Amino acid sequence: QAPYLSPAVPFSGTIQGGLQDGLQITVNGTVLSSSGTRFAVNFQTGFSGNDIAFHFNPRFEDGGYVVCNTRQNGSWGPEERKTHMPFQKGMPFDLCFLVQSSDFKVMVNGILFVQYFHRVPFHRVDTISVNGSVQLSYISF
């Protein structure tokens, strides 16, 4: 699949073929100053945003932390949080999502940040969306 170049945010785009084992999605962007306090990347089914297999949500609030969770039929499950923010505003970053049979491997600038085991079959994911206080340079597959 061709990369989405300079997509505007918010953004929603189809992931051709749907998520598949071995697929690596790269999200290159920059956290802005003066927008909001958080941004997110969502691996979802459809554009509704009601069913999100994997929600990666960095929050520049309360000291800085990232929320990882799944949303099924509009219902958010138990959150997984990490308190060591690997993001810095005004600095471009490479957010890499490696899809494996049992989990998502998430790397920030080549450094493994989190591991999220699939709560729902990843084959159900065909859409990636990004919103919040972030500017995108590109999304590659």
Ligand X SMILES: CC(=O)N[C@@H]1[C@@H](O)[C@H](O[C@@H]2O[C@H](CO)[C@H](O)[C@H](O)[C@H]2O)[C@@H](CO)O[C@@H]1O
Annotated binding residues for a beta-D-galactoside: 42, 55, 59, 69, 76-82
**Cα–Cα distance measured from residue 50 to residue 7, given in angstroms and rounded to the nearest whole number:** 22
For the CB of residue 104, give the shortest distance to ligand X in the complex, in Å. 15
What does each C-alpha distance from 22 to 3, 100, 136 come to in angstroms?
Answer: 17, 6, 23
Q: Which residue is nearest to ligand X (CB)?
A: 69
In sequence order, what E strands does the chain have?
A: 4-5, 11-14, 24-31, 39-44, 52-59, 65-72, 75-76, 80-82, 92-99, 103-108, 111-117, 127-132, 134-140
| Under 8 Å between Cβ of 41 and 49 | no
Could you tell me the sign of the dihedral formed by the alpha carbons of 1, 43, 119, 82, in that order?
positive
**Cα–Cα distance measured from residue 55 to residue 58, given in angstroms and rounded to the nearest whole number:** 10
Measured from the CB atom, the residue of 41 and 136 that comes closer to ligand X is 41
Q: Which residues bind ligand X (CB under 6 A)?
A: 55, 57, 67, 69, 76, 79
For the CB of residue 21, give the shortest distance to ligand X in the complex, in Å. 26
Measured from the CB atom, the residue of 55 and 118 that comes closer to ligand X is 55
For the CB of residue 4, give the shortest distance to ligand X in the complex, in Å. 22
Measured from the CB atom, the residue of 13 and 36 that comes closer to ligand X is 36
Measured from the CB atom, the residue of 83 and 101 that comes closer to ligand X is 83
Binding site: what residues are annotated? 42, 55, 59, 69, 76-82
For the CB of residue 34, give the shortest distance to ligand X in the complex, in Å. 20
